[PDB]
Amino acid sequence: DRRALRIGVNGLPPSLEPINGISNTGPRIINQIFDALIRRDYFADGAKGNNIKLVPALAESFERIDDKSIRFKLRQGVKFHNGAEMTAEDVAFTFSSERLWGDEAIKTVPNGRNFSPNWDEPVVEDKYTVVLRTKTPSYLIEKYLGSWLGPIVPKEYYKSLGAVAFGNKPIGTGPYKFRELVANDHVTLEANDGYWGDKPTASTITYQVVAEPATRVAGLISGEYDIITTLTPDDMALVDGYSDLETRGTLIENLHMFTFNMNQPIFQNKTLRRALALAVNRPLIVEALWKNKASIPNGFNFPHYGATYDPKRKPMEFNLKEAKRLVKESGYDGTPITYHTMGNYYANAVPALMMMIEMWKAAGITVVPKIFAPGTTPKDSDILIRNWSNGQWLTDGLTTMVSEFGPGRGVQKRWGWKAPAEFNNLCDQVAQLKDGEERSAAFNRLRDIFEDEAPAVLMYQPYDVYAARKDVQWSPVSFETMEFRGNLNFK
C-alpha cells in the first residue's frame, strides 16, 4: 500500500560501503541503509534544513568523558537488516584499526585514515557501552561520529565479505534495506519494517541514473520520477511552469572547484595554476548561472566552520591583467590545455566551464573541454584540469583543506601537489590543537599558502536544486544527501 519512490539521479556512487561511497551520489542512498550513533537534526527549531544540532541515534545517550573521549550508551534491541542485534562489538569494529584507520584497512577503505581524527582503539565496556577516543585532544569527535564517517556496520557480516563486497550488498540498521543494484543504472531499496525509529513511508526507493539533466527534467515532466536531483536555479522556469511540479533548493555545505594534475609539467609550479584562478570572474558566473543564490567563499573559509570561520578574510581577486602576466612568465606556449568534465555530473559544470574558457582566452590561455561519458574513467595521465567538489562535512576548518589537501592525502599523493613543508606542519598542528587562537592562527596561514599555491581553485558553494511532484512532501537539507526520516510523506 505504501507508494514506491522513483528518484532520477546524476549518478550512482562507486560503492555503498559508507566511507568508500563518500561522494555527491552516495549519501542519498547510504543514509537510508545505515544509522550513525549521532544524527544531525537538520529541521530543529524550524530551521530550513540547515540546523547543526546532533541528536541520539544508535546511541540512546552519550557523555563526553574528557577532551579526547566519549562514552556511548547504545540503544538496545536495534537489529541489522539480516536480523542481527547491534551491539558495542559492531560500533567498536566500525571505528577500529582493523576496519577504518589501520595500515591494513586503508588498502581497501582508502580514505579511512585520511578523513579520520587521531583515533585510538575503541573500548567495549559492556554489551551496550563503548568508549570512542583520540590519542590527542580533539573537541571534534561528536562531529566526526555524526558525519558521513559515522554509519555503523555489522561486524560479523562485513568481516565475512570485506569492504568492497560489502559495498555491493550492504547491511545496516537504517529505515531502508538494500534490495538490488545494476551498475551505472539503478539501486533499489525497500522499507525495513523492523526499523527502530520513524516507520518508513515509501514501499521502495529506486535511484535511477539519468546522466543528462535535460532528460532527467523531461522524465519528471512525463511522470517517470517523483524527485530528481542536481538541477540549477535556472531550471526553475521550466519546472515551476507546471502546476503539479516545483523546485526545492538550498545552499549546501559543499564547494564546487577545479583542480589540476600537478604531476603534469605545465602544472608542477603555482604560476599557471594561479593564472587560471585570477582569470575567473566568479561573481559573473554566480549571476549568470546561479541567480545569485550560490555563495562565493572568502578563501578556503565558510561560515559553517563556526569558531574557525574568519569573516574578515578578503576573497580571492578577479585580476585579468595579472593572469595575462603570469601566463607569459610561465613559459606557456599556446598548447591547448584540456578540462575534463563528466558532463553535468556537477550542476552547471559545462556552462561554467564555457564561461571560464572565455575568461581564460582573455588571459592568453587556451582551454578545451574534454566531456567524458559516465562509465568511461579517464586515466590520471590524460588529465590536465578537472572539476571536483568537496563536501565541507564538519563544522570546523579541518575539513577539507586538511582532509583532502593535507600531507599523505589524495591531492598531494595522487595528484602531485608539492605542498610547502610549512603547510604540512600546520596541518598536523590543527588536528592536535584544541579550539583557540593558535588553531585559528594556523588556519589563517594554511589558507594563505593554499591561495598562493592554488592546488585547486574554489568556484562557489552551490545552491543545490531538486525538483519534485507536489504530492511528494520532502524538504532538501543543507548537505549533499537526502534525509527522509520525518521528512517524506505522500499526499
Ligand X SMILES: O=P(O)(O[C@@H]1[C@@H](O)[C@H](O)[C@@H](CO)O[C@H]1O)O[C@@H]1[C@@H](O)[C@H](O)[C@@H](CO)O[C@@H]1O
The amino acid at 435: D
- Phi, psi of 236, rounded to the nearest 5 degrees: -55, -45
**In this complex, which beta carbon is closest to ligand X, that of residue 309 or of residue 345?**
345
Going residue by residue from 233 to 272, which x/- string records binding to ligand X, judged by CB under 6 A? ---------------------x------------------
**In this complex, which beta carbon is closest to Na ion, that of residue 37 or of residue 266?**
266
Minimum gap (Å) between residue 266 Cβ and Na ion? 5
Q: Pairing between strand 245-251 and 227-231?
A: unpaired
Region for 309 from its dihedrals, namely left if φ exceeds 0, alpha if ψ lies in -120 to 50, beta otherwise: beta
Site residues (CB under 5 A) for Na ion, limited to 240-279: 266
Tell me which of ligand X, Na ion, none is bound by residue 254, counting a contact when its beta carbon lies within the kind-specific cut-off of 5 to 8 angstroms.
ligand X
Q: Which stretch binds ligand X (CB under 6 A): 239-247, 261-269, 320-328, 384-392?
A: 384-392
Tell me which of ligand X, Na ion, none is bound by residue 476, counting a contact when its beta carbon lies within the kind-specific cut-off of 5 to 8 angstroms.
Na ion
24 is a contact residue toward ligand X (CB under 6 A): yes
Position among 138, 330, 400, 478 found at the interface with ligand X (CB under 6 A):
400
222 is a contact residue toward Na ion (CB under 5 A): no
Please compute Rg for the chain using Cα positions: 22
User: Nine-digit cell at 298?
Assistant: 572568502
Q: Which stretch binds Na ion (CB under 5 A): 73-81, 322-330, 372-380, 476-484?
A: 476-484
Tell me which of ligand X, Na ion, none is bound by residue 35, counting a contact when its beta carbon lies within the kind-specific cut-off of 5 to 8 angstroms.
none
Give the E-state strand segments of 137-253 in sequence order: 176-182, 186-191, 204-209, 227-231, 245-251
Tell me which of Na ion, ligand X, none is bound by residue 138, counting a contact when its beta carbon lies within the kind-specific cut-off of 5 to 8 angstroms.
none
Give the residue from 326, 325, 388, 318 showing the smallest Cα distance to 359: 318
- Phi, psi of 174, rounded to the nearest 5 degrees: -70, 175
**In this complex, which beta carbon is closest to ligand X, that of residue 269 or of residue 295?**
295
**In this complex, which beta carbon is closest to Na ion, that of residue 335 or of residue 376?**
335
Site residues (CB under 6 A) for ligand X, limited to 141-180: none
**In this complex, which beta carbon is closest to ligand X, that of residue 31 or of residue 400?**
400
Query: If you search the block for the grid coordinates 539480516, which residue do you land on?
Result: 82
Minimum gap (Å) between residue 211 Cβ and Na ion? 20
Q: CB of 14 within 8 A of CB of 20?
A: yes
Q: Quote the CA–CA distance of 297 and 304 in Å, as a whole number.
A: 11
Position among 5, 19, 22, 209 found at the interface with ligand X (CB under 6 A):
22
Minimum gap (Å) between residue 250 Cβ and ligand X? 16
Q: Quote the CA–CA distance of 292 and 411 in Å, as a whole number.
A: 30
Minimum gap (Å) between residue 255 Cβ and ligand X? 8
Q: Which residues of 221-231 are buried (b: 16+ CB within 10 A; e: fewer)?
A: beeebbbbbbb
389 is a contact residue toward ligand X (CB under 6 A): yes
Position among 35, 404, 451, 453 found at the interface with ligand X (CB under 6 A):
404
Give the 3-state secondary structure of residue 237.
helix
Going residue by residue from 300 to 339, which x/- string records binding to Na ion, judged by CB under 5 A? ---------------------------------x-x----
Position among 14, 102, 343, 407 found at the interface with ligand X (CB under 6 A):
14
CB-CB neighbours of 491 under 10 Å: 6
User: Nine-digit cell at 8?
Assistant: 532520477
482 is a contact residue toward Na ion (CB under 5 A): yes
Q: CB of 314 within 8 A of CB of 298?
A: yes
Answer positive or negative: Cα dihedral of 400, 405, 411, 414. Answer: negative
Total binding residues for Na ion by CB under 5 A?
Answer: 6
476 is a contact residue toward Na ion (CB under 5 A): yes
CB-CB neighbours of 322 under 10 Å: 15
**In this complex, which beta carbon is closest to ligand X, that of residue 190 or of residue 404?**
404
Q: Which stretch binds Na ion (CB under 5 A): 16-24, 305-313, 404-412, 474-482?
A: 474-482
Q: CB of 26 within 8 A of CB of 228?
A: no
481 is a contact residue toward ligand X (CB under 6 A): no
Minimum gap (Å) between residue 10 Cβ and ligand X? 9
Q: Give the DSSP letter of residue 434.
A: P
Give the residue from 165, 183, 120, 230 showing the smallest Cα distance to 20: 165
- Residue 10's Cα: distance from chain center in Å? 14
For ligand X, the binding residues (CB under 6 A) are 13-14, 22-24, 254, 388-391, 400, 404, 480
